[PDB]
Amino acid sequence: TPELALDWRQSAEEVIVKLRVGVGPLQLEDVDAAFTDTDCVVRFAGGQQWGGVFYAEIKSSCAKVQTRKGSLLHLTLPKKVPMLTWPSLLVE
């Protein structure tokens, strides 16, 4: 979680997005994440919104957790497609 920008990761295990909120007050709305059996949306309280797109399956990856508490917005995303090369970090 850098003090320069934002920390995210994708690994064979999980998609992590940690976003720092400078959008004034932190409200529960501060991540709007839409996850479908074939797609995903990550939304920041402002305009920092990311996602992914799948053709199939993902309702296990529809399982998502996000942390808010301060300056950190954290999505724990179960593995979408492990060892498979994605078109982009966020594909939406």
3-class DSSP assignment, residue 29: helix
- 21: number of Cβ within 10 Å: 19
State which amino acid sits at residue 32: D
3-class DSSP assignment, residue 73: strand
Beta pairing partners, 76: 16, 65
Query: 13 with 82: CB under 8 angstroms?
Result: yes
Distances (CA, A) of 25 to 6, 47, 68, 85: 18, 15, 12, 37
- 12: number of Cβ within 10 Å: 10
Domain layout of the chain by residue ranges: 7-78
Q: Which fold has domain 7-78?
A: Immunoglobulin-like (2.60.40)
Query: 56 with 41: CB under 8 angstroms?
Result: no
Output the six-digit token pair for 5. 């920008």
